[PDB]
């Protein structure tokens, strides 16, 4: 309490220094994040079936392990997709609060019941269960300043020497290699094989037999014979290491001594395990790693660990190899937090100068300026106790808690100065009186201002974490600001205030004299005839933009989805990606620093007809003006890529979450609960697409996410004919698979590393249907017969990527809400699917739509509860049921101001806007008490006339209100005009609060007849 | 059984090591392969790590790489145990 | 815990040099560190140095010309000298393994490899010597 | 006792028994998991 | 015969099951009816 | 040892700062605390 420290200033300075030190230590170990882990944890099961088609990798793999995904708790949903590459991808999304480790350990226990039921190819390829984000924490490209290594060689080096060291780094959920490590590629030649009466089965068997690592016991192994005088290991054949050793693999010996070696009927080389992904950096050949963030892991520390890991493998790179970062989303977070910590220090510099224009004394203005940092440091410590991190929300909070913080330091210092000036007391007695006067009042406004934010901590919802973070940050700061006001400022203002320019103070004197003269004319009804205009500005004056919780900003990065027509090859996708790269590096050069084009990487589904280009933009400063922003760059790009033929090139902006919030669109999923099949489900999707096409007002951009049915080659192997000719069905299947699909045989040792050995046909002999004629099968009598002898082939149609939602076949329809109109009401599809689709097809929601189903309209309840609690706290502080009304009529003014910018600057009702509104509704209320408290106090002492103390002897004490208003207007001045990183949320709060306070400072001091209406209009 | 330092390294230790990622709070990993048909991989985790969760995560990475090991190794069995304090006591049993 | 004065250095092979080149580097490091007794003492390798190993090279062409499954040769060698565990048997109340191995006296010297015969594809037993050669070499008994 | 840590504790020493199980049991696959002993509700399906 | 997972609310688990059954009902064949021959949740409601 | 980076001096520098502060709060003077902090070596020499 503020008397034990007045005589003991050294005791109050020690407390302040201790709080500052605690705040320092907190920041040192306080996580720099961007938002407080909103995304629900997701667990991904990925399996691989070589040479498979979407159907043959779903019936054998997907729904063999998906029928076992039962008894897993806290599971919102499960979506699987299986594509013609031979890959499966089952994503289980759990509840928001689930423990990802326990969710990854139960998904693993239940997958192991289906693990032995899978094909051997899938098992020996490697099933990976890994918890991670759906988008890349970063991408680490690997160029060659020279030209000594091709993209395949760079990919091999990255995979062998960098990929696994990186993947073990803590916080790295998963790494996707944009390439493929070497493997011993045996390109079989069907002509040579047929010439020697051989088949791919014989080649595979020979490789397996002659490429092995054999355990051959010991020369003196135990149990030992008596008198054993030697012990050594026996070293039988080992794994072959070089392409020369494989070439000598003896397939068979001819009757006339003509040895047949592997190199005779095949080409042996070192080549990627898979040739799908092909990366390029600004045109040149390159490779890289796309790193995801393990769920519930900090991105900043993970990236720091990644960059550090790379800096210790860098000394050992081959000459010429270099390392680039063509995609990194963490630098944006770092730079944005720099801007908030700077506008923090800047909103301290701005008050420091303002309280000089008013207090006009260096010593006097030094009491509150040092009461700001303490609180700020202190509240950091508080967060370290509560387990929160340093993110944009917590930091924008700290910034919005600059006025509410300094207001009392201002109250205390001005009150002590006023009493010294009036009664001429020495500083010690002056404050022993000022504090005894206004100690409990200042605490009482502490309770009132927290009642605006305490109900926000217990919001409840998906976004309730953001509200809780903001509310905790402000409540703690305000609590500490009052502790300081009761501990330090009484001790400071007792000692460092002197016990005793001109134009400025004279002008201020004239100013508040005129202000008091104007306020004396309180008896006038139009003050309130006008207040009705402010009141009616709630139902309307709403631009009604609730279509944004989080403004999507540059991130200094974006992707460029490339989706060629189904059936395109790798060369076509490479051409389109070259066009995209040329556009970015020629027409968009002054903004785009690099373009990492990954041909073959499938954002939705890996394939040959898909691509993606991670684009990194130049320094935010080197991009001045809106025209050089991401949303603009992406709009212009998409326009310029609409002139491209046979391709879908969409350049989009990634939001702040790993991935959520597609312009408040919908994520429809059409599922079928009857055994309709793919044909009827596709027809139902077509009907729904047609129905949604002719409702442009209500729906827009209803795009079917996924690949469209493509031709495929159905080759019926007549088994009866195969038995008649003596060929075995197993030989036929092995020949077809190993010739056209590639058959992983076993391992070999390359430079002391386990790598795979693959047997596949030479590219030229598996290109066309006619090439099926080149392949022969050896019958039981040694006679080679073609596939034409027992097989008949034709062209059919089949989907290249089959999806399932919650275990049933599904088709995902992405869409935008509507032109002008928002989402929620845009759910016409609920009443458009049942009535316009056949029986047996249902419909569902996923991701963003799923979360918005349960969440939604809860802010008004928060506002109502806060308002009632504030009103009650005011009633308690004032001991009257009617006085609080005179203070609850100043909330409209701040609300209406915040809306000046929601109108002039098209600001959306963001959560930033919601917390910014709350700020100036409990603050317009704060300045209202600054006026009604002294009005009441003077009304019960030194003048008992209502008018005397209402608008006359208290209005003249308007210095604090002006100092605080100007101090918190200058503090948020940068936030409004900021063009640094995160300028989005920066402006969102800045403009709203500035507009709120500026209309709530000028309309509130003059709406004083509300405290003069106490006469008979009680309640 | 019967394998040597480099037979059991090329067939077991490398296979296990390459599929030992995605484990949280992993300080480092060091493996020995003896000429006696033995592999003794050891993953040291960050202090303050939960032993049970770390062990189950390792056991999880190991049971998806098991199909890649030789049939002899799978048949023998691969055991993941959290190394802890020394023997409380040793109880010899003899025959007179 | 480990002694306070002690330190645990590692010589990683960051470029796939091999075992021999890494051993050369380790020898160089130990020799150099032996020149600083004032600061470093007892600087020694923790691992084991290479020992002789009996390498058996089954000639592929010989084995095929004679006619025998190289898998059969490998299985014979492994099960005879190292012991192939086969099945599980229950005796009283718990499963116990069934191990197949050669009798001790037949797998104790290099010459003993000549006592082992592999049945050819035509039912004729060929000795190891017919399709296999052997010599002493050097290998690591513990690779880390 | 939190059932999740109990389940992982049971699981990480059950897997120590796989060497001793007949290789047949492992092909079927054991299923260590939290479980109750009584039914919340039986939902029957008839055909009218 | 549905069970209650270790540490889950009987009334939230029983409402969710009823909702899922309701959403699967429209796709049932021509003749099929869900009955609840045993449910311990009506008791909870009555006792509360 | 290499990872920690010799944090003991940093932790004990904090203790020379916090002990000084707590003594300044007790003696309400910034100089008297030095009279107490100069008795630190009196025991260290004997122990050594
Ligand atoms: C949880 C409760 C923690 C303590 C409760 C207060 C204990 C009462 C004693 C007390 O505060 O003594 C006051 C000064 O002592 C002081 O030392 C003032 C307290 C200032 C904080 C000291 C350390 C921080 C004298 O006040 P009073 O309570 O006798 O009545 C006010 C009329 N003088
Ligand atoms: C006081 C509250 C926190 C202020 C931050 C530092 C100020 C003083 C430093 C130490 C004083 C108290 C220590 C404390 O609360 O935890 C330390 C700082 O906490 C943190 O900064 C968070 C780390 C998480 C620890 C849980 C405590 C909250 C780290 O504590 P520790 O590293 O020993 O935690 C081992 C858990 N087994
Ligand atoms: C009492 C005055 C409050 C000042 C600091 C409060 C201590 C922190 C605390 O317990 O608050 C959080 C939850 O409690 C709360 O929600 C508030 C209860 C305060 C006790 C902790 O939250 P946490 O458990 O994430 O902190 C990581 C710890 N291991
Ligand atoms: C949960 C809490 C329920 C809601 C309470 C509402 C908080 C409003 C606090 C402001 C009321 C101010 C008031 O009348 O009491 C003050 C102390 O309150 C402390 C000052 O009253 P005082 O103690 O200075 O009055 C001298 C005679 N003792």
DSSP H or E run through A587: none
Pairwise CA distance, residues A667 & A689, whole Å:
13
Long-range contacts of E6-11 (CB under 8 A, 24+ apart): E6/D3, E6/D34, E6/D35, E6/D36, E7/D3, E8/A73, E10/D40, E10/E40, E10/E41, E10/E44, E11/E41, E11/E44, E11/E45
In angstroms, the Cα distances linking A530 to A536, A597, A851, A894 are 10, 61, 43, 15
- Residue A236 touches partner C, C-beta closer than 8 Å: yes
Contacts of B92 (CB under 8 A, 6+ apart): none
- What is the layout of strands, in order, in the sheet containing D39-46? E2-3, D39-46, E33-39
- Are A648 and A612 within 8 A, CB to CB? no
Whether ligand 4 lies within 6 angstroms of the CB of A250 is answered as: no
Selecting from D7, D8, D29 the residue whose C-beta is nearest the C-beta of A112 gives D29
- Orientation of helix A911-939 relative to helix A983-1002, angle to 10°: 30
What's the DSSP call for residue A188? E
- Residue C37 touches partner B, C-beta closer than 8 Å: no
Chains F and D touch (3+ CB pairs under 8 A): no
Q: Which two tokens stand for residue A913?
A: 């806007």
Closest by Cα among A265, A248, A125 to A741: A125
- Rg over alpha carbons for chain C, rounded to the nearest Å, is 23
Contacts of A598 (CB under 8 A, 6+ apart): A178, A277, A278, A279, A280, A611, A612, A613, A614
What's the DSSP call for residue B23? -
Pairwise CA distance, residues A46 & A131, whole Å:
11
Q: Which residues pair with C97 in a beta bridge?
A: C88
Q: Which two tokens stand for residue A925?
A: 């209320």
> Which residue shows structure tokens 């990492």?
A596
DSSP H or E run through F16: helix F8-27
Q: Do E5 and D34 touch (CB under 8 A)?
A: yes
Q: Do A235 and C65 touch (CB under 8 A)?
A: no
Q: Which of residues 164-203 of A touch B (CB under 8 A)?
A: 164, 167-168, 170-175
- Residue B21 to chain C, least CA–CA distance (Å): 19
DSSP string, A638-675: HHHTTTSSS-EEEEE---SSSS--STT-EEEEEEESSS
Pairwise CA distance, residues F25 & C38, whole Å:
50
In angstroms, the Cα distances linking C97 to A980, C84, C85 are 71, 11, 7
Number of neighbouring beta carbons within 10 Å of residue A718: 12
Residue C76, judged by CB atoms within 10 A of its CB (0-12, 13-18, 19+), counts as: buried
Residues of D with Cβ-Cβ distance to E17 under 8 angstroms: 41, 43
Q: Do F25 and A17 touch (CB under 8 A)?
A: no
- Residue C95 touches partner D, C-beta closer than 8 Å: yes
What's the DSSP call for residue A227? T
- Residue D14 to chain A, least CA–CA distance (Å): 12
Q: Which residues pair with A480 in a beta bridge?
A: none
Pairwise CA distance, residues A595 & A583, whole Å:
10
Q: Do A235 and C53 touch (CB under 8 A)?
A: yes
- Are A104 and A112 within 8 A, CB to CB? no
Residues of C with Cβ-Cβ distance to D22 under 8 angstroms: 88, 95
Closest by Cα among A992, A786, A969, A977 to A898: A992
- What is the layout of strands, in order, in the sheet containing A753-761? A266-272, A182-188, A753-761, A743-750
Taking one residue from A and the other from C, the number of pairs with CB-CB distance under 8 angstroms is 93
Pairwise CA distance, residues A388 & A398, whole Å:
13
Closest by Cα among A841, A836, A852 to A665: A852
Residue A621, judged by CB atoms within 10 A of its CB (0-12, 13-18, 19+), counts as: exposed
Taking one residue from C and the other from D, the number of pairs with CB-CB distance under 8 angstroms is 4
Pairwise CA distance, residues A344 & A392, whole Å:
12
Closest by Cα among B82, B21, D29 to A131: B21
Pairwise CA distance, residues A748 & A213, whole Å:
9
Give me ligand 3 centre to Cα A480, in Å: 16
- Residue A73 touches partner E, C-beta closer than 8 Å: yes
Number of neighbouring beta carbons within 10 Å of residue A618: 15
Pairwise CA distance, residues B2 & A215, whole Å:
5
Backbone angles phi, psi at C102, to 5 degrees: -75, 155
Which ligand is closest to the CA of A384, given by its number?
Answer: 2
In angstroms, the Cα distances linking C18 to A234, A610, B28, B68, C51 are 21, 40, 22, 24, 17
Q: Do A73 and E8 touch (CB under 8 A)?
A: yes
Q: Could you state, in order of their start, the residue ranges of all structural domains in chain A?
A: 1-37+329-500, 38-132+799-806, 133-179+276-328, 180-275, 501-554+855-1019, 555-659, 660-709+807-854, 710-798
Which ligand is closest to the CA of A378, given by its number?
Answer: 2
Q: Mutate which of A30, A383, A387, A465 to test ligand 3's pocket (most atoms within 8 Å of Cβ)?
A: A387
Q: Do B5 and C140 touch (CB under 8 A)?
A: yes
Give me ligand 3 centre to Cα A341, in Å: 25
> Which residue shows structure tokens 């009186």?
A433
DSSP string, A889-931: TSHHHHHHHHHHHHHHT-----HHHHHHHHHHHHHHHHHHHHH
Give me ligand 2 centre to Cα A36, in Å: 20
Q: Do B75 and C85 touch (CB under 8 A)?
A: yes
Q: What string of H, E and C letters represents the secondary structure of B25-83? A: CEEEEECCEECCCEECCEEEECCCCCHHHHHHHHHHHHHHHHHHCCHHHHHHCCCCCCC
Residues of B with Cβ-Cβ distance to D3 under 8 angstroms: none
- Residue C11 touches partner A, C-beta closer than 8 Å: no
- Are A315 and A369 within 8 A, CB to CB? no
- Are A148 and A278 within 8 A, CB to CB? no
- Orientation of helix A959-977 relative to helix A392-400, angle to 10°: 150
Chains B and E touch (3+ CB pairs under 8 A): no
Q: Do C95 and D23 touch (CB under 8 A)?
A: no
- What is the experimental resolution, given in Å to one decimal place? 3.1
Q: Give first-to-last CA distance, chain E, whole Å.
A: 25
Whether domain C51-142 has CATH 3.30.2090.10: yes
Q: Which of D17, D22, D27 to mutate to test the interface with C (most CBs of C within 10 A)?
A: D22
- Are A425 and A494 within 8 A, CB to CB? no
Q: Do A674 and E5 touch (CB under 8 A)?
A: no
Pairwise CA distance, residues A105 & D5, whole Å:
11
Burial A92-127 (b: 16+ CB within 10 A, else e): bbbebebebbbbbbbbbbbbbbbbeebbebbbebbb
Whether ligand 3 lies within 6 angstroms of the CB of A385 is answered as: yes
- Orientation of helix A9-28 relative to helix A464-495, angle to 10°: 150
Q: Which two tokens stand for residue A62?
A: 């997907």
Closest by Cα among A410, A449, A403, A433 to A929: A449
Residue A445, judged by CB atoms within 10 A of its CB (0-12, 13-18, 19+), counts as: buried
Selecting from B3, B17, B22 the residue whose C-beta is nearest the C-beta of A174 gives B22
Cα torsion D8, D10, D12, D18: sign: negative
Q: Mutate which of A4, A5, A10, A439 to test ligand 1's pocket (most atoms within 8 Å of Cβ)?
A: A4
What's the DSSP call for residue A516? H
In angstroms, the Cα distances linking A573 to A176, A278, A600 are 20, 10, 8
Chain F neighbors (3+ CB pairs < 8 Å): A
**3-class DSSP assignment, residue A634:** helix
- Are A555 and A598 within 8 A, CB to CB? no
- Residue D23 touches partner A, C-beta closer than 8 Å: no
Q: What CA dihedral angle connects A34, A37, A43 and A46, to 10 degrees? A: -10
């Amino acid at each position: 309490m503020p008397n034990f420290f007045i005589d003991r200033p050294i005791f109050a300075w020690v407390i302040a220094i201790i709080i500052m030190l605690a705040g320092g230590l907190a920041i040192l170990k306080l996580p720099v994040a961007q938002y407080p882990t909103i995304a629900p944890p997701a667990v991904t099961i990925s399996a691989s079936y070589p040479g498979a088609d979407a159907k043959t990798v779903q019936d054998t793999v997907t729904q063999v392990i998906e029928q076992n995904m039962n008894g897993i708790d806290n599971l919102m949903y499960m979506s699987s997709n299986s594509d013609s590459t031979g890959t499966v991808q089952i994503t289980l999304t759990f509840e928001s609060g689930t423990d990802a480790d326990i969710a990854q350990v139960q998904v693993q226990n239940k997958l192991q019941l289906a693990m032995p039921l899978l094909p051997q190819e899938v098992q020996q390829q490697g099933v990976s269960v890994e918890k991670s984000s759906s988008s890349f924490l970063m991408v680490v490209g690997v160029i060659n300043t020279d030209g000594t290594m091709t993209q395949e060689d760079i990919s091999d080096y990255v995979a062998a020497n960098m990929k696994d060291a990186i993947s073990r780094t803590s916080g790295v959920g998963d790494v996707q290699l944009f390439g493929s490590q070497y493997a011993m590629r045996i390109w079989m030649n069907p002509n040579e094989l047929n010439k020697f009466q051989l088949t791919p089965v014989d080649v595979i068997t020979a490789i397996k037999a002659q490429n092995a690592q054999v355990a051959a016991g010991q020369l003196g192994g135990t149990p030992p014979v008596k008198g054993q005088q030697l012990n050594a290991s026996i070293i039988a054949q080992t794994r072959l290491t070089s392409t020369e050793e494989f070439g000598k693999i003896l397939l068979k010996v001819n009757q006339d001594g003509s040895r047949v070696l592997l190199r005779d009927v095949a080409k042996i080389e070192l080549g990627g395990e898979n040739y799908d992904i092909i990366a390029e950096f600004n045109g040149q050949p390159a490779s890289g790693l796309g790193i995801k963030l393990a769920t519930g892991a900090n991105a900043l520390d993970t990236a720091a660990a990644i960059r550090a890991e790379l800096a210790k493998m860098e000394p050992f790179f081959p000459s010429g190899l270099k390392i680039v970062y063509p995609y990194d989303t963490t630098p944006f977070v770092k730079i944005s937090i720099h801007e908030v910590v700077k506008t923090l220090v800047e909103a301290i510099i701005l008050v420091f100068l303002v309280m000089y224009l008013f207090l006009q004394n260096f010593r006097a203005t030094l009491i509150p300026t040092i009461a700001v940092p303490v609180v700020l440091l202190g509240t950091f410590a508080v967060l370290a106790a509560f387990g929160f991190s340093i993110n944009t929300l917590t930091m924008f909070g700290m910034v919005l808690a600059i006025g509410l913080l300094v207001d009392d330091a201002i109250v205390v210092v001005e009150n002590v100065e006023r009493v010294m000036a009036e009664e001429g007391l020495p500083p010690k007695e002056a404050t022993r009186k000022s504090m005894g006067q206004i100690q409990g009042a200042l605490v009482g406004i502490a309770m009132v201002l927290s009642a605006v934010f305490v109900p926000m901590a217990f919001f409840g919802g998906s976004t309730g974490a953001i509200y809780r973070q903001f509310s905790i940050t402000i409540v703690s700061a305000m609590a500490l600001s009052v502790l300081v006001a009761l501990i330090l400022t009484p001790a400071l203002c007792a000692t460092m205030l002197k016990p005793i320019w001109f134009n400025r103070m004279f002008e201020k004197s004239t100013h508040h004299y005129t202000d008091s003269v104007g306020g004396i004319l309180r008896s006038t009804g139009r003050y309130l005839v006008l207040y009705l205009i402010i009141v009616v500005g709630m139902a309307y004056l709403f631009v009604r933009l609730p279509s944004s919780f989080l403004p999507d900003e540059d991130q200094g990065v974006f992707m460029t989805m490339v989706q060629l027509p189904a059936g395109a090859t790798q060369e076509r996708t490479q051409k389109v990606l070259n066009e995209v790269t040329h556009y970015y590096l020629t027409k968009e050069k002054n903004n785009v620093e690099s373009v990492f084009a990954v041909n073959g990487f499938g954002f939705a589904g890996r394939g040959q007809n898909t691509g993606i280009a991670f684009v990194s933009l130049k320094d935010w400063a080197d991009r001045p003006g809106e025209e050089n922003k991401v949303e603009a760059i992406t709009m212009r790009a998409t326009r310029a890529f609409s002139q491209i033929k046979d391709a879908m090139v969409f350049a989009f902006n990634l939001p702040a979450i790993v991935e959520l919030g597609t312009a408040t669109g919908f994520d429809f999923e059409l599922i079928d609960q009857a055994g309709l099949g793919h044909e009827k489900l596709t027809q139902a999707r077509n009907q729904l697409l047609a129905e949604a096409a002719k409702h442009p007002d209500m729906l827009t951009s209803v795009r079917p996410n996924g690949l469209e049915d493509t031709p495929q080659f159905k080759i019926d192997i007549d088994q009866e004919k195969a038995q008649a000719l003596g060929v075995s069905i197993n030989d036929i299947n092995t020949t077809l698979g190993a010739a056209w699909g590639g058959s992983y045989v076993n391992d070999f040792i390359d430079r002391g590393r386990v790598k795979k050995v693959y047997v596949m046909s030479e590219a030229k002999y598996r290109m066309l249907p006619d090439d099926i004629g080149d392949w022969y099968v050896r019958a039981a009598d040694g006679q080679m017969v073609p596939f034409s002898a027992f097989s008949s082939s034709r062209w059919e149609y089949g989907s290249p990527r089959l999806e399932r939602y919650n275990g049933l076949p599904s088709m995902e329809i992405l869409g935008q809400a509507a032109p002008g109109k928002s989402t929620g009401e845009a759910m016409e599809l609920m009443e458009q699917l049942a009535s316009k689709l056949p029986t047996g097809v249902g419909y569902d929601w996923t991701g963003m739509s799923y979360q918005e189903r349960l969440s939604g309209n809860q802010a008004p309840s928060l506002y109502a509860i806060s308002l009632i609690v504030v009103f009650l706290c005011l009633a308690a502080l004032y001991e009257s049921w009617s006085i609080p009304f005179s203070v609850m009529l100043v909330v409209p003014l701040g609300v209406i101001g915040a809306l000046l910018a929601a109108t002039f600057r098209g600001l959306t009702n963001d959560v930033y806007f919601q917390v910014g509104l709350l700020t100036t509704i409990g603050l317009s209320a704060k300045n209202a008490i600054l006026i009604v408290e002294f009005a009441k106090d003077l009304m019960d002492k030194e003048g008992k006339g209502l008018i005397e103390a209402t608008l006359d002897a208290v209005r003249m004490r308007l210095r604090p209100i002006l100092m605080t208003s100007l101090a918190f207007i200058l503090g948020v001045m940068p936030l409004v005009i900021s063009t640094g990183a995160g300028s989005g949320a920066q402006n969102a709060v800045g403009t709203g609060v500035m507009g709120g306070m500026v209309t709530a400072t000028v309309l509130a001091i003059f709406f004083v007849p509300v405290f003069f209406v106490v006469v008979r209009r009680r309640f």
